[PDB]
Amino acid sequence: SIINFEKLGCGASIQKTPQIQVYSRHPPENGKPNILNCYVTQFHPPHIEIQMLKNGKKIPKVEMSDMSFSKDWSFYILAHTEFTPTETDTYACRVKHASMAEPKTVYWDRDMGPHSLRYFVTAVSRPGLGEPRYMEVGYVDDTEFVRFDSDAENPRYEPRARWMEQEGPEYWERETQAAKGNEQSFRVDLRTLLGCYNQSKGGSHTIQVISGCEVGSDGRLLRGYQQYAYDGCDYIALNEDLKTWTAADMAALITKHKWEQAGEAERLRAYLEGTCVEWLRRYLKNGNATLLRTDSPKAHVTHHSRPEDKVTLRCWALGFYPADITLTWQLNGEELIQDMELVETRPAGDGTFQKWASVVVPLGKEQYYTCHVYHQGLPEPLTLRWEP
């Protein structure tokens, strides 16, 4: 259950470039249907335009995931489309974002315990295009389980996991009206923050919030979160003492003083230690079947030619959950962290994740190198080599 937010009350009346990965969900074999992913991360503002292309031509039926954002406030989204790869068909993803003067085209390179209840909130103004888009997304241990999206004719809180359907109508009614009340507070905050930052009246701006609690196995609050951002930058955040605020700039110093006078830190501490903890216990009970599940990675090495007497060994880790994982290459028992190439961990699109790490080695010396896969789902780290 999300908290009822208090207005920032700042006063009376920088963009990040996207990172792109294009990859198939499964190993691409010609003639076999597959899924082509376009993973776009680390961008701000949230507005973005993603097209997937086949031999230069736009692919019509491209499905897009809901947009989320990370702890560093940057947004990410997954686009994907059905495709049957052939030997000569070229695929690419093209991204248009305000941080770039031209659209970026990336071509598909077919190269062979404690718990937490957190709410991620986004409010994005759209001057001349309608009302601000407001979103509340709840997570139990990185697993999205509820969502409120204002972009509907009758917006309501919706279960995003099957185990949330047990909650009765009184729950969804109360959460829905709480979200609509929260939406109004952020609409007002978007209005006043314009003047507090001396900004024009016709541009799109964003407020982001991360609110919730991390609770240990003993039921005690490990960490409480109440962190705000405006236009992707730190605005104000509750400190770990749950008593004082860290205001990131001058405009937030007005909010800090007002919240001190109103005793907002005490209201948040009561929610975090009480309501948040009690609801997390309820959500953990109802989702006990699938929330604790982990899928260990399946791993293998691929072999790629290089100019002259070098080859590339690429160590794959596939189908694992959660996303936290470590891949290392070793020569003679020492880790070659200094000369590996990695890709950021990426979703397969079916709930599991992918990652690979590569190293350039001399031709004929492939059997001298070992890849190591560390994941919490493994009873022991994986160790493997290139098998011809």
Curated annotation (Swiss-Prot):
The keyword Cytoplasm does not apply. Residues 113-202 are annotated as: Alpha-1. One of its GO terms (biological process) is positive regulation of T cell mediated cytotoxicity. The keyword Transmembrane applies. Glycans are attached at N198, N288. This is H-2 class I histocompatibility antigen, K-B alpha chain. GO terms for cellular component: external side of plasma membrane; lumenal side of endoplasmic reticulum membrane; MHC class I protein complex; phagocytic vesicle membrane. Keywords: Disulfide bond, Glycoprotein, Immunity, Membrane, MHC I, Phosphoprotein, Signal, Transmembrane, Transmembrane helix. Involved in the presentation of foreign antigens to the immune system. It is a single-pass type I membrane protein. Residues 295-386 are annotated as: Alpha-3. Heterodimer of an alpha chain and a beta chain (beta-2-microglobulin). One of its GO terms (molecular function) is peptide antigen binding. Residues 297-385 form the Ig-like C1-type domain. The gene is H2-K1. Residues 113-388 are extracellular. It comes from the Eukaryota. Residues 203-294 are annotated as: Alpha-2.
